[model samples]
Target: TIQEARKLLPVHQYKDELLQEIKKNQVLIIMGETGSGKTTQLPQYLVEDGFTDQGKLQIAITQPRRVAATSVAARVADEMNVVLGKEVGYQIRFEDKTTPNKTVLKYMTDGMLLREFLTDSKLSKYSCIMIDEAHERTLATDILIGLLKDILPQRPTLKLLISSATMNAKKFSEFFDNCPIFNVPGRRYPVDIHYTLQPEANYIHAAITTIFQIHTTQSLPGDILVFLTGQEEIERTKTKLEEIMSKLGSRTKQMIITPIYANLPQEQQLKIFQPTPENCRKVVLATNIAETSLTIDGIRYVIDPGFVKENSYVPSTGMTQLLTVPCSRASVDQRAGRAGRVGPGKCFRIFTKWSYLHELELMPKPEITRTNLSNTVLLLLSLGVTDLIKFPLMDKPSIPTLRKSLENLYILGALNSKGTITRLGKMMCEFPCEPEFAKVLYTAATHEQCQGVLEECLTIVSMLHETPSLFIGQKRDAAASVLSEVESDHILYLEIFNQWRNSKFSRSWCQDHKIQFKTMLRVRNIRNQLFRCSEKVGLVEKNDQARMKIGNIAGYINARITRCFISGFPMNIVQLGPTGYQTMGRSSGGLNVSVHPTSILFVNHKEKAQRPSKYVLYQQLMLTSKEFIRDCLVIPKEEWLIDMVPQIFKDLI
Candidate 1:
């Protein structure tokens, strides 16, 4: 029965041709639609076809997200009748499931594969590499494409498969020396797509209204899937939908509202995949997390808000801003395809058809051009790719952006004056974090009298990485007030982590503090991983010396910790100005910024006497409605900046 089902997929018909093509060409671009079975079936086809050379060389498939990689690996393992982590396994950021020399089919995130280059630049272990969903063009995927291209000539036996759901096959083919393309039709039912006559002022309200409209008129058995931008909008829509349904009372059918996002706990996220109850309709609110590689069963109707939250770096200010922008045509098509998986379905787009054709971009901008390239540049340089200006990127970043990354890396001591990766940079690449955080760990390890600073830095860096999902719902203000005793947001995170640990990581403790328990758990996992990485890199001595008691900060310890941070973030120093806070570094000097309202250091105008310290360092600068600095710590003494990184603050002295 399993073999029967496997033979019925659209990709099954082309199995012979696909294998023949792979056997013939060194590079092949695969154009397959969603639900085409390209992801799960192709790897098995390769394995059955002896492409893995009898499990001697692994076939590596890279997904853009962790959930996709892990879930797809599980599905493939089930289909192959093999135990997971044996023949089929996955590797994500904090977890590695693959057994060395045993996993013939490995599914991993693109970033993980990129990190593998640090150890083996040529990827000598893999006989074939499949980059699925190549249309997304994440920063890591682009870098991998370029790196793989360079390695292909050296390893003529290596086969590369670039798979995408969009019509960008020709571009990918052109990049890979005009490789041949293989197309696999998807098993999609007809979907009727409708567009709004005009743009709505508020898509959240419109999305909620559409959900009820379908519930009232549409027949039972078909669930609804609504695409939103992020957590805040998803929560607001869920609350409003619940309130309106309660008021209508028995007139409307029972509707189950569930939300899914990347940061959601695993248990809660699984609710979206659960079967719908009798006489009830399920409405799933989601971010782009539902757009690709994930399938929710049951008949479906789709509502797309035509917006997404995107992060882009501003080279002039050297800050990354998350902006809510219009979704591209490719993304809209992907969202519409979600409704057609089971049967004939309908899709309601909350934007005009004219806008879809004329206003929205044909494809989303590749992240390589818009994101901070310092970490990527560091990795490439360490991979022995010199002359970055001529790097074979599909879409090259602007000259100014590249220059800024080089300057920042040089200042962080990751690069020498000649723009070569220094020994420090190689060590920085070992940690799966930003170069600045790695530099902070180095400072903590080497600084004399900096007792227990590495432990503190580990926790702080992990918490900061998960800050966006740390707090939940309307209780954010309450949580902030309760945790506002500390002056620094960085220190405030430390306090929460310590409190949660002291409570033995109890869920009730998280509820009382209005924090996301799962996010805290993730922070702890990341902290532990970083701790292990520090040990592997000789940044910390073996044994329990690194696990210091986390509470009760001492003045000397605080001073040493902040100084360690300064060693990495010397360019982030800010001072009080007439209108707002202004940066002091030469690169981003005179830029006006303000503390985010969520920060413990933020003060209202009425609290003029309770002004924050004159000088501080921010972990990041984000541009929302305004330019706001987040995760701030007081400098304590201006002279410390000069002492720690005189190269940056020499002008001040």
Candidate 2:
């Protein structure tokens, strides 16, 4: 069996020497292909090598996603013949699996390790950490490496192993120049590839329609995997094909359709990895989540659309939007690798074959340049780091973006000119959502309904990155009706929550009434976590007199959500147009009309006499989205400050 393992997985091409070195260096670079068996067997190698000092040694491994972390751990745990919680455990945010007698191997998200380190610096509990997928360069992963750069010298006894695929080994190895290299030969079959002509991106519609023509006429196998830029196109394709399939009743079996994205509910995402039903052709639609870090099980066919949607901002436009562009050569190869993962396969590219041949870059630019760094700057300032130029960054943000992020935080009262988190900032960090969550906590302390605020804010923030199917098709109208009343008011989240709590947690309610019970549950959990976070930071006490302190804090939240807005994020304001749509047309910078369509998309769509009123200063919505972005009704900063500090003092007691 071990011989088969080595023959199939073919232990790191540079095996013996690397294994010996993995034991000594604070960091080791492991590069291999998907089936090379590194991900599943590396931990076993370390453990069997006696890396864990019997129930005492804690070896932590990190991945970019929770699903991967958990799945990999389960695989290793099974081979070890131990319960998952003992000798093997996986830790993900908001969920953890650990047993009293547990020791040794643990798999976790890179960010989870950061959270742990935030509480414990020496990492005294763990002797080694294996960082997998080092090439993905996620924000958390890069930051974790920078953090470990410092943490390593302190825990000289700590051992680190960095894993990546083949191509970027040299670049990554250079980052860990002090570490040793262990290049593993990937047991990958050859994959055939073809590239088509590039088209005007807006012509994606025509490009996609070409696929049906190709299968209808060519010797194509009928099973295909297509990569699109985002969910928008994925939805359009799924709906159209399903409709066509409906007329041909059983013909639907000829096509197996599924959407794959990080945000896809865990169940649906896993569906992509499942084997296609026998005798049926599979068409798996996916985003860049399937790009590099993940591998789907039975993908013998890959049709790379050559476009990916990246979140970016334009300094001239003062807006953030998603754009479609061709992926890098590395990305092209990754997609190709999927085809041959299990057997020799084929990859077809939609763009001109020459496009990739002429490309100047190997991977897409790091997201740091593509994103607005306003949030990053604020968090860094809160951490007491100023002069952003001095901090070590894997991909440093642009000067303008950094300056903007810092000033925004200053407006929020999170940090002073000296770059220290103020009392208010401290409280905000205590809440999980944003610094604003802390402000909400300060306000709720005055009301008997502080618990309600907690319930609302946590749900909104926790689910920011995950958009469920709750608002699809007809149910969308239902969600809109609820949103109409909650316009720009975060408190509205609680009201929606109460509706879920009172009603049946039924798919019928979710479909018939247009509610999101799953989302509601997620929000409830987030609320509880926020409260716990608050309790830890001393913003809310557990003592009997706690009620009074909460009340005092709530009353001090007198800085109405609008007033609070003026204090922070002053630049993000816009006005409502005559069409009842919030617009930037009247803003300091001229723009015709721009409404997220979601924030106020549901606002009073029914027949009504809609006209602006000076008296109607605040938005009408009571929902959390509105709460997140409502206009700030400016008050004297000092007066607001004097009034709010008492709430801070009360929270401390």
Model 2 over residues 1-653: C-alpha lDDT tens digits?
32343334456455567677865666778777654566766777777676777777688888886656766666566567688777788887655787645757888887688667545767888877888877777666776776677667677788887788777677767676645677776547888787666543554565456555544444434356777766667878888777766766774246678765433465764455455566666677766432322222455677777766555554432234455556777877877777775567777766666677785257756666655554455445445455577766656767776565555566556778776767776566434444543554554433333322333334444434233333555423664555444333333433455565566544555555566556555555655676687678654553224444444345333334434332233333334445442322222343323333343322433324233221112221122222222221223233433344333223322
In Å, residue 196's CA in model 2 sits off its true spot by: 2.7
User: Residues 251-341, candidate 1, lDDT per residue (tens digit)?
Assistant: 8679888876555555664465456778988887777632333433575799988888787786554546677788988888888988876
Give the clashing residue pairs of candidate 1, or none: none
Q: Give all TM-scores, in the order shown.
A: 0.90, 0.77
Per-residue lDDT of 112 in model 2: 80
lDDT of each: 0.79, 0.56
**After superposing candidate 1, which stretches have Cα over 4 Å from the reference?**
1-8, 53-55, 77-86, 187-190, 245-251, 263-270, 274-278, 289-299, 448-452, 472-484, 503-514, 542-553, 585-590, 603-609
Candidate 2 worst ten-residue window by lDDT: 614-623
RMSD of each: 3.5, 6.6
For model 2, what is the error of residue 178's alpha carbon versus the real structure, in angstroms, after optimal superposition? Answer: 4.4
